[PDB]
Design a protein that fits this description.
Chain H: Its main location: plastid. Chain H: It comes from Chlamydomonas reinhardtii. Chain H: It is found in: Plastid, Chloroplast thylakoid membrane. Chain H: This is Photosystem II reaction center protein K. The structure is cut from a larger assembly and holds eight protein chains of seven kinds. Chain B has about 240 residues and is mainly alpha-helical. Helix content of chain B is about 40%, strand content about 0%. In chain B, helix 1 crosses helix 4. The radius of gyration of chain B is 22 Å and the shape is globular. The termini of chain B are far apart. Chain D has about 35 residues and is mostly helical. Chain D is built from one helix and no strands. The relative contact order of chain D is 0.10. Chain E has about 220 residues and is mostly helical. Chain E has one domain. Chain E has four helices and no strands. In chain E, helix 1 crosses helix 3. The longest helix of chain E has about 35 residues. The N and C termini of chain E lie far apart (about 50 Å). Chain G is built from five helices and two strands, in the order H-H-H-H-E-E-H. Classes of the chains: A mainly alpha (about 55), B mainly alpha (about 240), C mainly alpha (about 60), D mainly alpha (about 35), E mainly alpha (about 220), G mainly alpha (about 190), H mainly alpha (about 35). Chains A and F meet through helix 1 of A and loops of F. The structure holds chlorophyll B (2 copies), chlorophyll A (CLA) (4 copies), 1,2-dipalmitoyl-phosphatidyl-glycerole, the ligand CC(=C/C=C/C(C)=C/C=C/C=C(C)/C=C/C=C(\C)C=C=C1C(C)(C)C[C@H](O)C[C@@]1(C)O)/C=C/[C@@]12O[C@]1(C)C[C@@H](O)CC2(C)C and the ligand CC1=C[C@H](O)CC(C)(C)[C@H]1/C=C/C(C)=C/C=C/C(C)=C/C=C/C=C(C)/C=C/C=C(C)/C=C/C1=C(C)C[C@H](O)CC1(C)C (2 copies). The site of the ligand CC(=C/C=C/C(C)=C/C=C/C=C(C)/C=C/C=C(\C)C=C=C1C(C)(C)C[C@H](O)C[C@@]1(C)O)/C=C/[C@@]12O[C@]1(C)C[C@@H](O)CC2(C)C has 8 residues of chain B, from helix 1 and helix 3.
Amino acid sequence: LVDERMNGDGTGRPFGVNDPVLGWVLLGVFGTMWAIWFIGQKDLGDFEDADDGL
Amino acid sequence: ADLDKWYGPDRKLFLPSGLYDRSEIPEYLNGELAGDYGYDPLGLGKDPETVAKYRENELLHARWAMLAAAGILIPEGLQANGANIKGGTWFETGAEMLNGGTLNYFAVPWGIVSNPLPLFAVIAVEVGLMGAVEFYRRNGTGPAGYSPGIGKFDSSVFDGLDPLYPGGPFDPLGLADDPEVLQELKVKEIKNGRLAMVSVLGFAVQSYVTGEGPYANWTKHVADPFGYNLLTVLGA
Amino acid sequence: MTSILQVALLALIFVSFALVVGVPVVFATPNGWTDNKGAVFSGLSLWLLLVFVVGILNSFVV
Amino acid sequence: MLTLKIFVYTVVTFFVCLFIFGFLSNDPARNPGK
Amino acid sequence: IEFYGPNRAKWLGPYSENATPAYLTGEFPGDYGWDTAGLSADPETFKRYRELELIHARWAMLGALGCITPELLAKSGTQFGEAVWFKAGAQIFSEGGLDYLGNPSLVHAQNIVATLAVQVILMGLVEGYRVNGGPAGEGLDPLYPGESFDPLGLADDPDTFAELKVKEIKNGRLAMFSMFGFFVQAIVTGKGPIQNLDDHLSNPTVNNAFAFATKFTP
Amino acid sequence: IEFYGPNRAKWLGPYSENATPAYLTGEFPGDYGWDTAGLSADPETFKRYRELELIHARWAMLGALGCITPELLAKSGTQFGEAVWFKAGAQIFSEGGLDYLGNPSLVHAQNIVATLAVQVILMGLVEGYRVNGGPAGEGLDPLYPGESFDPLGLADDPDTFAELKVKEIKNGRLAMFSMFGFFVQAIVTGKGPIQNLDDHLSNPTVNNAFAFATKFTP
Amino acid sequence: GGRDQETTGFAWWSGNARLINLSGKLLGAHVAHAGLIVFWAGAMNLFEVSHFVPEKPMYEQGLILLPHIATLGYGVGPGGEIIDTFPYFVSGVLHLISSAVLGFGGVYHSLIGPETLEESYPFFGYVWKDKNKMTNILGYHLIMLGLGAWLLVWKAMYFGGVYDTWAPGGGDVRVITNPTTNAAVIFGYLVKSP
Amino acid sequence: LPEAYAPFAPIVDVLPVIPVFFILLAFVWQAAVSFR
Ligand code: CHL
Ligand code: CHL
Ligand code: CLA
Ligand code: CLA
Ligand code: CLA
Ligand code: CLA
Ligand SMILES: CCCCCCCCCCCCCCCC(=O)OC[C@H](COP(=O)(O)OC[C@@H](O)CO)OC(=O)CCCCCCCCCCCCCCC
Ligand SMILES: CC(=C/C=C/C(C)=C/C=C/C=C(C)/C=C/C=C(\C)C=C=C1C(C)(C)C[C@H](O)C[C@@]1(C)O)/C=C/[C@@]12O[C@]1(C)C[C@@H](O)CC2(C)C
Ligand SMILES: CC1=C[C@H](O)CC(C)(C)[C@H]1/C=C/C(C)=C/C=C/C(C)=C/C=C/C=C(C)/C=C/C=C(C)/C=C/C1=C(C)C[C@H](O)CC1(C)C
Ligand SMILES: CC1=C[C@H](O)CC(C)(C)[C@H]1/C=C/C(C)=C/C=C/C(C)=C/C=C/C=C(C)/C=C/C=C(C)/C=C/C1=C(C)C[C@H](O)CC1(C)C
């Protein structure tokens, strides 16, 4: 062609993902945030039936 | 729980207790029987003496109706899928043995098994064997032997107590020996019986109106649920 | 057969009028379930019989 | 443009994951309470 | 020939070999003393191996008779299609169903995962019931229940019941030894066992074992 | 504690004899009671089987993840020669040696007998050190040491480390069963396992396993 | 007491909130409401049947419910013609009758029936704290919705057919033979950009 | 209307307005106690 462009309009791809390089970033952020949260689970309230509602 | 839901005062009736008053029950029923829903809107059994023969008639009709509901379909259920058995329409099954009929087998076992036609030594054999069995159910001790199950007919019969539930040589495994398990199987027997009873009319009125195969009513109605109703058959 | 439909349909509509008028009154009266109980039973039974009769007769209407 | 696109997805998914794992992290007890 | 006590029929025989593996002197059916690898010195292990041998014998009788039957039916009078008991497992994919006894009037089944899903649930429930009871007679004997399992009652006399134990395990170990022969001449000749027997009744030794013995030269 | 004690989660639920085998009730992680063969009636035998099972588990995790990872990376965006763990070993012979990560500027390894020699030396070192205790840790516990190769220090509390024991064993048993699955799939289909997953997700009813059911016909 | 202002603390314009601790009356409210929904679904359908003209296109008449039955494909032919009205009449009359049963059940629970089912019925009773019981009721609702979806699947696969609009020579009712159930295709639409 | 149900065409055309009157019925029912 004349120029260079991604051509991502009208494709219909999941999460707008084109490269697998683009795809790994979702899990690479989600898993690390989940891991930080799962470490931070130590200083929270875990319980048998001590439920927070009426 | 097991006996409590189906006996006693607070058993399950045929209507909810918001439609009842829990005191308007006909007082001659009062539990102590399997299959007791407090159901008598007319009062055709108002004496407790009538209830005994009504129990007997109920149990006999149930035990015949189960075998009727099985055998009314199972050969037809083989033939409509393609068996070699002579015609499975139950209302015409009698007029096939008329002067030269045969049959087949493989209910549980294997084998295509024909029959050298015994019909005139079948009518009187039915009459004679039922004339044995029915008077035996009345009072008769009968012969003793030929080894079914356990016991193998030791002497003759019980000393009594069994107008409906003999169970001596009739348990080849000793099925009901605990009384609560016996009562559970009583409730299951009377329920399966009454459903077979209503099913017999369910076959019979279809044979009146439609005049088609009752097992074929499956393969017509489940295939086409708006091509086979009352509204497609009555109007025609 | 058309009149056989229509008389049953007018009867069904009038039974439904009887239900909508009386059955809330019988329910909301504080002893109405004790007093008018078999009347409600017979009314519901008659309503069901009229519905099934109209449904069967619509097959015979050609 | 792809160098920009990885960065935009990184920032967006970082803030959305911070949101979700914030609200899973014992929200209705950080009130004045009773 | 008593098969119990100190005078059970040793497997060797005339070389009866007194001073056996000395942790057994009869008292359980099948005991001859043949423990040469030495694996069951402990009593609990020995109980587990009685259990495992008994259950494998009682499965191996059915596994042998289910290979005896259909080729004899193909000899005498029936129709099967895939009559050989190896390819009989592939009768779901065969044409249009699985004709049990070759009659397309009964079951005529497809949907192999549906058949397997029925099989796994039923076998799991009946094996859990074999472990610890529930219905059908409470768990009373881990190997020899008999209560609901005697519709005839051959367990009446104790000496005859011990004789039936010994006949049971004698007639079990034979089936267990035969099934390994089924599995070996499965791979070696590929063909039916009654096919091999109908070859070997006619042919004494010209097709015996050794023509089918030059296979694994790489 | 639910995970071990007299009321652990047994290997059949309610159908677990309503009783354990009579020699193990808790006191060790991963105890469900499934010794039905009774192979570990003696306590030193049982200790040897734990000391073997834990090491097979800890190798089976790495053997899982190192099999999965190249069919992710090469099929996503990189080049590995061949990424399937059949032909992962044959990358030395292929064209110029084994380019690690497909890059002929890092390792670019050749000389397979030299790599074998380095493997034999270093694994002899670490498998002697695991038994006796050498550098970077004295031999004190053959299975759960808790020293300089546990830097983050999570085994300080007794109860949380007792739970993490059971987590390690459960993941270990799963990893072993999965690796057995990898090996049997490797025998049967001859394809990569993530390739098998992508082939199964396209048509689950016909590419199930039963298409590959007439391969080993005699 | 029950229907009071100064004890319940709720005004007349917040009257439904007096049913938060009343399971039987709450059930009667819901079943009466379902009766209203089925009654509207019958009444507007029979209204459009009474005003329907078949020679004229269906969108030129201002009808909304009859196309929902014509899309399933009762009483239609090729090209979108209308051959019958009796399926539409049946679909009206069945709702118009079933609404009476649901209205009777709703009025019975909301007037005579017991307020708290947790006393004499340990199946139907429920406390808003009881998490296992709430998950039970949610499971029953999900099973009923699953059978509701399989009714549509069976109507497509076996019973008559569904009016496709992509058949050649104009739209036509056809029978689906191979429903494409590829997970990588069907879970595309849930993720595609809006 | 398709058939002999044709003379009910007046009372068909009263049906869909009927569900709206339940709101007014509830307002009149709560005005019957003079809003208390
Ligand atoms: C005194 C003579 C006498 C002899 C020699 C035997 C022999 C045997 N008895 Mg015994 N018995 C004898 C007396 C009696 N037995 C019995 C009743 C029984 C029973 C019920 C049983 C035995 C069994 C045994 C076996 C025990 C060891 C074994 O398992 O061998 C197996 C190992 C070998 C035979 C060695 C293998 C050599 C073989 C020829 C090699 C084949 C060469 C191939 C060409 C090479 C293959 C190449 C590769 C690539 C495949 C052995 C064959 C047991 C048995 O049947 O085990 C199988 C058994 O269950 N006996 C009675 C009745 C009371 C006896 C009374 O006289
Ligand atoms: C009460 C119902 C219940 C049933 C039926 C089972 C069933 C089973 N659980 Mg169990 N569980 C159950 C409750 C529970 N389990 C567990 C947690 C566990 C664990 C952690 C484990 C089990 C395991 C087992 C197995 C134990 C026996 C065995 O090894 O199989 C042996 C029998 C078979 C394998 C037969 C399978 C039949 C199948 C149709 C064979 C296929 C035939 C092929 C065609 C053959 C191929 C031919 C050849 C030529 C290639 C068994 C399959 C063990 C297991 O599954 O390991 C693998 C195991 O590790 N369960 C919990 C949580 C506390 C339960 C709670 O209710
Ligand atoms: C889902 C709503 C619902 C729920 C939870 C209940 C629950 C209850 N009802 Mg009830 N009822 C309902 C709807 C409901 N009803 C409807 C619609 C009607 C009108 C017919 C009634 C009429 C009614 C009466 C007249 C009485 C009760 C009573 C009772 C209570 C105890 C007895 C009982 O259940 O037997 C009732 C059993 C039945 C009505 C049998 C139902 C018939 C089959 C199972 C229906 C199958 C249809 C199936 C689910 C498909 C759905 C149809 C459609 C939506 C697709 C119990 C709390 C009694 C009570 O208050 O005692 C204290 C009582 O006297 N009910
Ligand atoms: C290297 C294999 C190995 C070994 C030695 C052990 C060792 C042990 N396991 Mg164990 N286990 C393993 C793998 C192994 N496990 C796997 C893969 C699983 C998952 C299915 C389990 C699941 C498991 C449970 C659920 C339980 C045990 C228990 C036990 C202990 C007592 C049972 C015993 O004596 O086992 C002796 C085992 C062997 C000598 C292994 C023999 C290996 C040969 C090759 C035969 C195996 C063939 C195989 C069955 C064929 C199918 C393979 C396929 C199913 C994978 C013992 C420490 C019990 C316990 O208390 O845990 C500590 C217990 O309840 N195991
Ligand atoms: C469709 C919506 C709807 C529904 C289902 C309900 C239902 C209910 N409300 Mg309610 N409400 C509504 C809208 C609704 N309301 C609106 C819009 C308002 C604001 C004005 C209120 C304001 C309000 C207040 C202030 C209170 C309620 C209360 C109640 C409950 C008891 C009613 C009572 O005493 O019955 C008895 C009813 C009567 C004596 C009047 C007779 C009514 C009859 C039954 C009408 C039936 C007609 C129909 C054609 C019958 C068909 C029968 C069939 C067989 C054909 C009841 C469950 C009360 C409560 O909490 O209960 C303790 C309460 O205090 N509501
Ligand atoms: C669909 C589900 C639903 C349900 C079950 C409820 C249930 C409830 N809401 Mg609620 N609500 C909903 C949707 C819902 N709401 C929506 C969508 C809104 C946003 C508008 C609200 C806004 C809302 C407020 C602001 C409040 C509630 C309150 C309440 C509680 C008592 C209601 C009561 O008795 O009022 C009785 C009903 C009336 C007085 C009806 C008045 C009629 C309205 C104002 C206009 C009707 C317009 C109508 C379509 C016009 C038709 C044409 C006309 C010419 C006839 C009750 C738990 C109140 C409460 O105390 O909660 C604890 C409260 O303060 N809700
Ligand atoms: C096209 C298909 C689209 C699919 C979209 C999928 C969306 C997934 C949404 C997941 C929501 C999870 C909800 C929170 C779940 C939650 O509540 O966490 C908490 C839960 C454990 O809770 P507990 O604290 O009770 O654990 C028990 C003990 O800790 C009690 O002390 O952890 C999980 O179960 C995670 C489940 C898998 C979650 C996904 C795996 C996460 C790791 C994968 C990342 C890999 C890292 C790679 C590094 C490069
Ligand atoms: C409904 C039904 C009833 C059967 C009743 C029978 C069998 C009565 C036998 C009835 C048999 C009877 C009474 C036997 C009688 C034997 C007699 C008198 C002989 C004898 C002796 C002597 C000489 C040794 C002397 C001794 O001292 C006494 C005595 C008595 O021992 C069967 C139905 C089905 O069989 C069909 C019709 C078709 C199948 O497909 C389906 C099923 C269901 C199987
Ligand atoms: C004693 C001793 C002692 C010393 O010390 C040491 C030693 C020597 C080591 C020892 C010995 C041992 C031995 C001999 C063993 C063997 C075993 C076996 C062979 C088993 C089998 C076993 C076998 C078996 C069970 C089998 C089974 C089978 C079966 C079920 C079958 C099934 C089937 C059939 C129906 C047919 C179809 O077509 C298919 C199928 C489905 C497949
Ligand atoms: C318990 C019990 C009890 C009773 O009583 C009895 C019985 C039954 C006997 C028992 C059981 C048992 C069992 C089950 C077992 C199993 C095991 C296993 C399978 C293991 C694995 C195991 C497995 C394993 C380790 C694995 C490992 C692996 C590995 C390293 C790998 C490696 C690799 C990789 C990375 C990749 C590359 O490229 C190459 C290679 C080199 C290839």
